[PDB]
Amino acid sequence: KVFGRCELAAAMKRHGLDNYRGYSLGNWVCAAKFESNFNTQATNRNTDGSTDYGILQINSRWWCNDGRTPGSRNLCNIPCSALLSSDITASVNCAKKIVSDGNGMNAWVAWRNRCKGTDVQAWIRGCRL
Ligand SMILES: [Au+]
Numbered sequence: 001k002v003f004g005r006c007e008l009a010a011a012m013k014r015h016g017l018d019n020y021r022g023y024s025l026g027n028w029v030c031a032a033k034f035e036s037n038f039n040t041q042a043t044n045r046n047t048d049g050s051t052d053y054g055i056l057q058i059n060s061r062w063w064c065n066d067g068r069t070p071g072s073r074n075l076c077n078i079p080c081s082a083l084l085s086s087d088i089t090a091s092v093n094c095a096k097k098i099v100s101d102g103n104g105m106n107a108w109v110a111w112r113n114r115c116k117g118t119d120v121q122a123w124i125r126g127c128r129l
């Protein structure tokens, strides 16, 4: 599913991400924009052999099981395919664990490089939330 911007904002807000770990909703929408282009089915293989999955590009080395990432963990207790659903519940639940792990949203490299420090409220402009 390719979300619209305000459609994703509403869903993320419903699931309690607005200002989870102190990160405003616009941070999460901006992260999703540059991680996945709002596409729940996005996948991208990394040089280390892990893969990133779904709207927030959650990685198979620590967080989900894809069966092909040696030496990895599955700390979200989910198959990585659950992160590709049109229903973002599993991605949000896992994102909450990740953002709690110590480095906040710096765990998302596109957030650090493209969203951090920017006018992230622009990402929720015009949305009725
Ligand atoms: Au879909």
Ligand SMILES: [Au+]
Binding pocket: 014, 015, 016, 089
């Ligand atoms: Au929820």
Ligand SMILES: [Au+]
Binding pocket: 011, 087, 088, 089
């Ligand atoms: Au949902």
